Amino acid sequence: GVTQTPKFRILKIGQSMTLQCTQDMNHNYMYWYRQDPGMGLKLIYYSVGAGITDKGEVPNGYNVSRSTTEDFPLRLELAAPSQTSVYFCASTYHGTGYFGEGSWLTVVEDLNKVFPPEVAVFEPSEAEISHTQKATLVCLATGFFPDHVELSWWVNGKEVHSGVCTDPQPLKEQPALNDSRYALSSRLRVSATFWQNPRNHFRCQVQFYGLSENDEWTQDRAKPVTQIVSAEAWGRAD
Amino acid sequence: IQVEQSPPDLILQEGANSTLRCNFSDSVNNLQWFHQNPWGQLINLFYIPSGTKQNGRLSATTVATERYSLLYISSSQTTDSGVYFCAALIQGAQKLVFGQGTRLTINPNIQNPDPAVYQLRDSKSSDKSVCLFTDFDSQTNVSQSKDSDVYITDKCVLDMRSMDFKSNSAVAWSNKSDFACANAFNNSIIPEDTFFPS
Amino acid sequence: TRPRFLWQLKFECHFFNGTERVRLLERCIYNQEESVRFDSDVGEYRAVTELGRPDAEYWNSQKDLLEQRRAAVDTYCRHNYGVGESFTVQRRVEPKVTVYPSHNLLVCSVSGFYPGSIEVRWFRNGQEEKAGVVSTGLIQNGDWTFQTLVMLETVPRSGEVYTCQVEHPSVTSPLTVEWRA
Amino acid sequence: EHVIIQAEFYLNPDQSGEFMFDFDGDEIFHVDMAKKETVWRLEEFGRFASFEAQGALANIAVDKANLEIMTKRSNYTPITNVPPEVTVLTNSPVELREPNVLICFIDKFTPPVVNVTWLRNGKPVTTGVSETVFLPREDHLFRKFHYLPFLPSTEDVYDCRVEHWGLDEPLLKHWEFD
């Protein structure tokens, strides 16, 4: 298939960057797309073969080169906020189009705007257990900027999928504020009996993609690097 | 040139059949269907330049003559939610090119609704609490808050597979001292007989 | 000067009674020898010679390729006919018809017309003359016009009226140009 | 009734590749490789139709990759040169002193490489000349037309001089007011 790197990146204004895109299928045609939150895929650049590149609708600020069939690197010369987007690369030739997994890129005023999530877990309610025989755990991830999180649930050391829901949209903690931080909620519902077992352990686990070993950091608080933050409960007998 | 996709928006109950329309101008062909999912992931559904093609609950028809394509989804599942994009290839320039898409939302079928608002506490030092509004049917609409200091999530759909049981929940929270779960949601339009314990 | 190697690709779109039936023929030719082809009335590639067997085999396992080639009959063939139709298929250029001797040999010169298909007939006193009709043939000029010269063998005499008639899609009625002895 | 061919070649060492559309044997257009533009055979064609040429440019690059591979699979078998038939015709019945065109029909030949010069009494005449690209034949050989507008006169001898790797020598094909 198509593979593209940075899945996630935080860039400061003025910085440069390269998104790789590769494909082992021999497709001659390749494209870079961008996408703004809940909008359409707009075309940045495209190439029908080695040494042939051609502008799209929105090419201004990006360059592109295609010395080989296989690779189609996108290069951001100078980061502007307007370039905060999810980028997508594609390939076809005779039929089916193929997409990379995505590149989530946020361009920031300055790195001090980057924040990790705090993560709490809330035990199910005595009242729900009574009224449904079901128990619902809630996990909040709060106060993280870049919206770059992957939230997962682990029951007794194995990740679980059944009975989980995670908000597909995060929400702004300051809707008004331009680059406000974010909250995000998840649920794991299990049967009451399962929750009542004191030998069951429940971890809620959030992977945040932040700054790299290469970005300077001056501030009092912890440097917001890529990291896992979590909260856990054990089921209760009473 | 372009690719006109019809209903921009569709909300249907699970198990229903949904028809998506994508009309394409003379300048393009060799139609395709994509599903993004609510995490930005995209897969091809069909390369379908002409005729009928079928893959499980999905089928597609394109009449190249008449400039339209149609994605059919029988027996819609909640999991099919997301955005359905149709796309074609500009003739000559092999510029692949995407329509605005159809936001599809497939709501669960709450047979025995039992709307309720429960309060839940942090296991780490019990000052923090969260309000869970749970088990309302899929027509119940969870509004956003009057107060900027009060947080409310869009509902989302959890599946308890072993019990073939789906359920809806919205979480609300804040740390303003004049916030309780009684009115956490009463700014929304909630069922008259919602369970409010305590 | 030294050895040459030549590769040719051709996509032929063949049209019957308008766009009603349509057949796509994709051909690869190495050094003047065709080696493999997708015929849309067949549905898959076949090797025309052994040279192309590896190619017929390979392409027949690429699904996106077969399906695209199978739909091309509509996505490409019928498409392009629709774009060019007005000025290709419907291109009308009316012949210019002069008639002059060459004694014993008469010439009906018919030039600059278009589409190729045509009839020239000879008339001696408005009665058709079919014997001793010689035809240089129909010439394509390269520039979207054809030309023809149809001869007639007759030794003219005083009085005699000769006439050339030319039927053509560019004119609803046929051109008759006469020549007098 | 009608045939439309998208006709393409690449020539291995010459590093010429051409691309063009053919309708019943008349060029609709070709792509100029050097300028990467569509070149309509009749100017009016460009008003009733357009061509975006990227796909064409990328096919030629595949055609070359293919040639590269076919050249080898054949154990480097060269092409058998085939000499052209040449014919010299006017556009219309030659009228003394009234503008006409001479057509040099070059036909039934392979390698699509030819050198064609018009000669007038002996001297090459370069002014007013024009030519077609290499058009397809059913046998896979090529055709090609050269033109020269002239004032028919009693004085003039015109040769179409044709050069090719199949001919022992340049071929001169004669023409003079009948």
Binding site: - | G92 | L65, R69, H79, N80, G82, V83 | F48, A56, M70
Partner: peptide
């Protein structure tokens, strides 16, 4: 005016 289309060249297999 209207775009004339193309059909793309098929790659012969890598040796």
């Amino acid at each position: 005016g209207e775009l004339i289309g193309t059909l793309n060249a098929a790659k012969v297999p890598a040796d």
